[PDB]
Amino acid sequence: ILQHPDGTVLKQLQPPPRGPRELEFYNMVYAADCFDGVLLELRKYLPKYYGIWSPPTAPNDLYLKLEDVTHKFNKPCIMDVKIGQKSYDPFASSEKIQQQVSKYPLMEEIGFLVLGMRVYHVHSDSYETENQHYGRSLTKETIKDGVSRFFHNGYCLRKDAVAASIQKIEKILQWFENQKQLNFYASSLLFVYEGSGGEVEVRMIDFAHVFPSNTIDEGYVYGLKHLISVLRSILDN
Ligand SMILES: Cc1cc(C)cc(-c2onc3ccc(/C=C/C(=O)O)cc23)c1
């Protein structure tokens, strides 16, 4: 993720087939001739897409130019949460499935995985960051506290941002409960709230493993519902 002063991020296409699939996902959703109500609604929950971008002198080098969802924040607090029971896709080999399940064997049980967070602390005027190993450490016993950490600014628990997050996730959940044409594996929700101020963003990202489907995305829904339940329990802290 390259953050550009103009309010965008550049995301480099991952190696094939992942990068190409993500490009084609954005292209389908943001097709200027799209009249599919499901895809038109989905746009609300993605970063705005500004098309494929390559350096003037390097057409080999493929990026997605995307909206920087954090741009309108002063001190953005950022959490990336992978959603679903499976982070392997329907065409994974047995080895690929193990690779993926072994990354976090609780994925089936919990339905989400914190990929990281960046949390502004007011008292120190500083950020604390958690990496992939944080979320992968979390168990049924510690997931609630693990998520809570995102909404603690070193003085209070930001229950406003928690409530706002539930409300925005609910709209995404509603989108998933009214579509049976896409299934999303290893995709994430990006949570942003203002650390320095009620603004909150919850957007879907990471579409290297979105596939056509004829079913509800039950794994994604499970994850959304479990994540909401956790956030809801945090409101009782
Ligand atoms: C500073 C910072 C940190 C992180 C983790 C994400 C972002 C971020 O802000 N707007 C973002 C928009 C998109 C993506 C990735 C999209 C994809 O994989 O499809 C990431 C973003 C910004």
Author numbering: 65 to 260, 376 to 416
Paper passage:
Inositol polyphosphate multikinase (IPMK) is a ubiquitously expressed kinase that has been linked to several cancers, − and loss of IPMK kinase activity in cells decreases cell growth and proliferation in several human cell lines. The first crystal structure of any IPMK orthologue published was that of the yeast ipk2, followed by the plant Arabidopsis thaliana orthologue. These structures established that IPMK has the typical kinase fold, containing an N-terminal lobe and a C-terminal lobe with the ATP-binding site at the interface between these two lobes. Here, we solved the X-ray crystal structures of 14 of this new generation of compounds complexed with the kinase domain of human IPMK. The structures solved here show a polar contact cluster in this region, which together with essential polar contacts from the hinge region suggests the two-point anchoring ligand binding mechanism proposed here to synergistically enhance the potency of the IPMK inhibitors.
Compound 1 IC50 values suggest more potency toward IPMK (IC50 = 12.8 nM) than either of the related kinases IP3K-A (IC50 = 8000 nM) or IP6K1 (IC50 = 146 nM), with compound 1 having approximately 10-fold selectivity for IPMK over IP6K1. Compound 1 directly bound IPMK with K d = 11 nM by isothermal titration calorimetry, consistent with the IC50 value. Compound 1 contains three chemical moieties: the benzisoxazole ring that we call the core, with moieties A (acrylic acid) and B (dimethylphenyl) on either side. The core of compound 1 formed four hydrogen bonds with the IPMK hinge region, including three hydrogen bonds with IPMK backbone residues and one hydrogen bond with the carboxylic group of Asp132. The crystal structure of compound 1 with IPMK also revealed that moiety A penetrated a subpocket that is contoured by three hydrophobic IPMK residues (Leu130, Iso384, and Phe386). The four polar amino acids in the IPMK back pocket (Lys75, Glu86, Tyr90, and Asp385) also formed a hydrogen bond network with moiety A of compound 1. Thus, we named residues Lys75, Glu86, and Tyr90 the “KEY motif,” with this motif specific to inositol phosphate kinases. Together with the hinge region, IPMK anchored compound 1 with two hydrogen bond clusters, suggesting a two-point anchoring recognition mechanism. The core of compound 1 also forms several hydrophobic interactions with residues Ile65, Val73, Pro111, and Leu254 of IPMK, also observed in the complex of ATP with IPMK. In addition, Leu130, Ile384, and Phe386 are close enough to form van der Waals contacts with moiety A. For moiety B, Gln67, Thr134, Ile142, Asp144, and Leu254 are within van der Waals contact range.
